[PDB]
Amino acid sequence: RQFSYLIENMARDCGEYAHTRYFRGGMLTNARLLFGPTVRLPDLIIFLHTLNNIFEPHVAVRDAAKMNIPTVGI
Amino acid sequence: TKFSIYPPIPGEESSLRWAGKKFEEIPIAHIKASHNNTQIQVVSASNEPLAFASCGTEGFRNAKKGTGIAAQTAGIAAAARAKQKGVIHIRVVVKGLGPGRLSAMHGLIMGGLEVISITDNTPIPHXGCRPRKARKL
Amino acid sequence: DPPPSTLLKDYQNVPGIEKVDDVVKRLLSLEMANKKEMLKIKQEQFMKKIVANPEDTRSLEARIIALSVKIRSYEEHLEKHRKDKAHKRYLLMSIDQRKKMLKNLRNTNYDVFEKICWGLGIEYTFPP
Amino acid sequence: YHEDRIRAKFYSVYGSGQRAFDLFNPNFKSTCQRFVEKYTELQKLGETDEEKLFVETGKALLAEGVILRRVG
Amino acid sequence: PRYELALILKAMQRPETAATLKRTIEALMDRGAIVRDLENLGERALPYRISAHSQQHNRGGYFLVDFYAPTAAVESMVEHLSRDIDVIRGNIVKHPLTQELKECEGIVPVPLAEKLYS
Amino acid sequence: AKHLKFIARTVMVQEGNVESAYRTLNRILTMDGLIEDIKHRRYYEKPCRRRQRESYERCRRIYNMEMARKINFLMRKNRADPWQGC
Amino acid sequence: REVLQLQEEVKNFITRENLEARVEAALDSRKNYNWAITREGLVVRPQR
Amino acid sequence: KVWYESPSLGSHSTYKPSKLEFLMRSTSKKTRKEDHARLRALNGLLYKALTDLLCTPEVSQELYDLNVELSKVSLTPDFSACRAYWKTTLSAEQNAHMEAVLQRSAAHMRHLLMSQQTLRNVPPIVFVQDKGNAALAELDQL
Amino acid sequence: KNVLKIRRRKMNHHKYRKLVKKT
Amino acid sequence: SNEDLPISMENPYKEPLKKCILCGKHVDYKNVQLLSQFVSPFTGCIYGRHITGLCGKKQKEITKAIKRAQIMGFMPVTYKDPAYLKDPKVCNIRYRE
RNA sequence: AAACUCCAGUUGACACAAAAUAGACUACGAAAGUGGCUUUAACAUAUCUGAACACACAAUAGCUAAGACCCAAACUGGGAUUAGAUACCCCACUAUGCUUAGCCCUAAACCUCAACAGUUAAAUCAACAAAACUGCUCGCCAGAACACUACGAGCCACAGCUUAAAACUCAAA
Ligand code: FES
């Protein structure tokens, strides 16, 4: 959260997308239900931090692989 | 001088006095606080008995003897007989963890005696006799 | 046993030990030491009487001699302490270990095996 | 690093300098680093003793105006 | 070996105390001991009352006798001290200066996991 | 029985405050373990029972000290939220 | 070195001849083994 | 670990016992198995802190002379108040003196408790009186 | 674990000891 | 190869291990002044190492020294000898009021 | 309630009993076990494995003989309790716990982890316990119950221990 604001601005400035908030269960693995059957998922997910706030791997790391999304991560 | 909770050691030269008497000369109130009774004996520094009182000698019987108010009454009775013999300041030596352990001391004070020290002499064997077996309750 | 006047194994080869005061000789003798010091003199006596190289402590010969001294010490201990089950075990285990050593010496070097038996007074016996 | 041995002795003998580290400046030099550089220069001049190479280094810095207060 | 005899003597006058020490050191010599030193620790009040030879004692003279003796002398000396009426309490210990203290690097920490496991 | 009297477990009373003197004595005997010792000695605790209780008390103290250390360590971040809104 | 050190000490050892002199020489003297430690590990010898 | 459980997945989470956290909490959320542990152990820490202040003369000369003994100390889960219990004395006259000094000391003690940065956020301490059956003495007064 | 196997052995040994006593 | 690469060696900044107040000192049963510093003034109870701060080795030497001194007639058992009450307090225990 | 009242309290004298604190330590020994002090003796093995039975040990309880006996205490007696109480609760006291010299040889004798050697990479792994395995060796096991039993044999054991089945019975255990 020290960098949430910085990262969200970088995404908007480059014309891309940021998700720095609480990651709800199934955003990627259940996207059609949450967004709609025609929702397009990301083609690349860039992690500037790979751990969540309890020092466990961000759920999107596992779920990105499930959806066959390549991940860049610091 | 600052207050010391450590008693004056006999043979050393202390400045503390109580009615012109040294710590070694103050009479002793022996309180035996048992689980079912409380016995109080006041003796002189030379081991001369001056007063004796217990909850049983004060008309308490059975479970009533093992109460704080019974011990407090026993202290008042011993204090009265001791005060008649010239006792004002006493050293308290209490052995046992019975209900009249603290209450017996209150009665001595209410009876007109001034407690200058408190000593615990509850018998603790250092290894001794095997106590009775535990109770199934 | 060696005489009490015997010097300790450590002080026997210091130069000038024969010219010191009698009091100093008593303080460096077996009389003023524990029994373990008397056993070191016995072990060295057997090593020089029996083994070819008295300084080889890792040979099968030296081990049998060292263990034989322990066995005799246990026997003397148990002569006075007949209900000591702990040392009765140490004695019997040591006798078994010596028999195992003697078996391996008899099989590898019979000439040395015979000198060990004569020197230590061991009558070898085959197991039942 | 080899110089770490010199740093351990300097901190033991003279303690941490009352001057404050400025870890933002990538070219900052502390009193210990200045000591280490002089100690290295004198070693390259052929001196090999350790106890002697350390006492001569302190004198050089004092001549240059550096404050070296021994801890004890 | 080297022993240390911690000797508490009945509080007496100087002449009787010297006779007791001489009588005690001679007992060591008769048993083969080589006496090294005799130290006076001073007369003091005992830490508690000691009953010895049908008498109660509250003060005593503390003495040390450093000596060498054969291992068999200790048992015989302990019996000798029990019969001397002027000795309140006498104990023979191995001299502390013979036992060499091993060096200590410091206090190594103990892992907590081992504590509960053990 | 053979020791000097009025030295062990003896507290002097100050300004006639006998209640505070008794509390000091009780605190002394409690810290030295005498009160718990006297209580455990009223009935014989069997050796298998004493070892079980001593083992339980030693493990509970370790767990309590270890849980206190964790809370002390993890309370440094109890300060106000620096990035509120993010 | 241990035999040399020991050979000098034996000169001061008590003997049957010098027993009386050493016994009296002890009653006049005092040996103190008491000393206290501080939180810094320093020995505090007694005030005598 | 021991029979005492320490498998919590969020073991690295920073424990935050403050009054603001209670308001920003899911209403559905219920206390977890090892969530009581931190509360049970934090309340014990408060008992330790208070007990030392009473017996050290530096904190207050009046407090030290009283020789107050704490019977019980249990914080609240709300994080709004703290419950501390001290044992009453026989003399009702003496009881008044202890309560009066403790009542005024508490305000300063709270600041003294803030000196311990680990427990800097200390809710106002409620020095309840118990262990002496204060009502029984109150009944005799009537 | 449960002690049901121990209890069966318990009863068998109790009854055996009692039988031996009677006879 | 490269001069600036790290080199293998022992930690030069390592600090010495901690030592107890009695590390390196002989503990004698006749030194009752020292032994008295590790017993309770009111009860004579030997303090645990969590109170004395001693290491396992010196906690044991002190305990054996106290027990020897007590039964040989040098040290009281049921209380600390009052002569030694004003010695340096090296134990982490607070008693009075 | 019974019980004691040659009782209780203080002080002193006082053991063939048991060993606060230390010990929040985790040591010693083959295990069993070992925690007051001192001294003496003393803790096998310069490959490893190797026995229900050989050899030597083995808590508690128990037996035989002679002693000690503070305290505890089966049994027993007494006092309550209860529908009953040959229990739990209270009191008294014995065998016994102790010493000596012999036996007896059993434990949930259990870290419920066989010894020795090696590994942390694979697949981490039924579950739980105590992370998962490899080499090597000895011992042991083959549905339940019958069965810590019967018979045989050995044994200082004689209401004992060790070794240890079968028939009938079931579809589970
Ligand atoms: S720390 Fe070295 S002996 Fe205690």
Ligand SMILES: [K+]
């Ligand atoms: K003991």
Ligand SMILES: [K+]
């Ligand atoms: K077990």
Ligand SMILES: [Mg+2]
């Ligand atoms: Mg059956």
Ligand SMILES: [Mg+2]
């Ligand atoms: Mg083998």
Ligand SMILES: [Mg+2]
């Ligand atoms: Mg076998």
Ligand SMILES: [Mg+2]
């Ligand atoms: Mg077989």
Ligand SMILES: [Mg+2]
């Ligand atoms: Mg068997």
Ligand SMILES: [Mg+2]
């Ligand atoms: Mg047996």
Ligand SMILES: [Mg+2]
């Ligand atoms: Mg028996």
Ligand SMILES: [Mg+2]
């Ligand atoms: Mg009885």
Ligand SMILES: [Mg+2]
């Ligand atoms: Mg009997």
Ligand SMILES: [Mg+2]
């Ligand atoms: Mg066992």
Ligand SMILES: [Mg+2]
């Ligand atoms: Mg095996």
Ligand SMILES: [Mg+2]
């Ligand atoms: Mg079957």
Ligand SMILES: [Mg+2]
């Ligand atoms: Mg059986």
Ligand SMILES: [Mg+2]
């Ligand atoms: Mg059978």
